[PDB]
Amino acid sequence: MLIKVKTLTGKEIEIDIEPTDKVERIKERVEEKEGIPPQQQRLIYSGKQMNDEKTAADYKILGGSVLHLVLALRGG
Amino acid sequence: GGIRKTRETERLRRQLLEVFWGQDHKVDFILQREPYCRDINQLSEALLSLNF
C-alpha cells in the first residue's frame, strides 16, 4: 500500500509503507527522502494529531490516502 | 559565494547516483524551494538534461 504526504511548501511526497507500521517509522522514511529529522516533523490526518506510539492502521489509512505533515519552521 | 550544488545535482542526473537534485523527491526539489544554489540545480539540470 502506497500513500502521499503533503508538505508546507505544497509538495506531495510519494512513499510506500504498510498499515501495521508505526508513525515514527514513516517519519524516518521522510527524513531520508527530504532531509529533515522525524522529531521536528508532525503527521496530521482528518483533523487529529498522530502519535509516535500509534500506527497508521489506528487511523484506518489505506493505500491511496493523502496524509498531512506539519513540523519544523524556517522563518518567523 | 564559496561552494555550489551544481556538481552533485548534474552528475547524478547525467550518469552518477541521485545526489542533491536526485534523492528521489529531491530531483525537482532543488529549484522548487527558495535557495539560489538549488534553483540552478533543477533549473539547469532538470531542464537541460531532460529536454536536450
From Swiss-Prot, chain A:
PTM annotation: Cleavage of precursor form by UCHL3 or SENP8 is necessary for function. (Microbial infection) Deamidated at Gln-40 by bacterial cyclomodulin Cif produced by enteropathogenic E.coli, Y.pseudotuberculosis or B.pseudomallei, leading to impair NEDD8 ability to activate cullin-RING-based E3 ubiquitin-protein ligase complexes (CRL complexes). Deamidation occurs on NEDD8-modified cullins. NEDD8 deamidation prevents switching from the inactive to active state by maintaining the 'closed' structure of the CRL complexes. Deamidation may also impair its deconjugation by the COP9 signalosome; However this result needs additional evidences.
Keywords in alphabetical order: Acetylation, Isopeptide bond, Nucleus, Ubl conjugation pathway
Record annotation: effect of changing Q40E: Impaired ability to activate cullin-RING-based E3 ubiquitin-protein ligase complexes
InterPro entries: Nedd8-like, Ubiquitin-like_dom, Ubiquitin-like_domsf, Ubiquitin_CS, Ubiquitin_dom, Ubiquitin_ubiquitin-like
Residues bearing the modification (Microbial infection) Deamidated glutamine: Q40
Annotated crosslink Glycyl lysine isopeptide (Gly-Lys) (interchain with K-? in acceptor proteins) location: G76
Positions carrying N6-acetyllysine: K48
Record's keyword annotation contains Nucleus: yes
Outcome (variant: E31Q): Decreased interaction with B.pseudomallei Cif protein, leading to slightly decreased deamidation
Effect of A72R: Prevents adenylation by UBE1C
TM spans (from-to): none
Impact noted for substituting H68A: Decreased interaction with B.pseudomallei Cif protein, leading to slightly decreased deamidation
Subcellular location field: Nucleus
Keyword Phosphoprotein part of the UniProt annotation: no
GO terms (BP aspect): anatomical structure morphogenesis; modification-dependent protein catabolic process; protein localization; protein modification process; protein neddylation; proteolysis; regulation of postsynapse assembly; regulation of proteolysis
Tissue-level expression: Highly expressed in heart, skeletal muscle, spleen, thymus, prostate, testis, ovary, colon and leukocytes.
Annotated spans, Interaction with UBE1C: 70-72
Primary subcellular site in the record, as a coarse category: nucleus
Annotated disulfide bonds: none
Annotated GO MF terms: protein tag activity; ubiquitin protein ligase binding
Function: Ubiquitin-like protein which plays an important role in cell cycle control and embryogenesis via its conjugation to a limited number of cellular proteins, such as cullins or p53/TP53. Attachment of NEDD8 to cullins is critical for the recruitment of E2 to the cullin-RING-based E3 ubiquitin-protein ligase complex, thus facilitating polyubiquitination and proteasomal degradation of cyclins and other regulatory proteins. Attachment of NEDD8 to p53/TP53 inhibits p53/TP53 transcriptional activity.
PANTHER family in alphabetical order: UBIQUITIN (PTHR10666)
UniProt subunit comment: Interacts with AHR; interaction is direct. Interacts with NUB1; interaction is direct. Interacts with ESR1.
Family, as annotated: Belongs to the ubiquitin family.
Protein name: Ubiquitin-like protein NEDD8
Record organism: Homo sapiens (Human)
UniProtKB/Swiss-Prot annotation, chain B:
Assigned protein family: Belongs to the N4BP1 family.
Protein name stated in the entry: Protein KHNYN
Organism: Homo sapiens (Human)
Gene from which the chain derives: KHNYN
Covered residues, full protein: 627 to 678 of 678
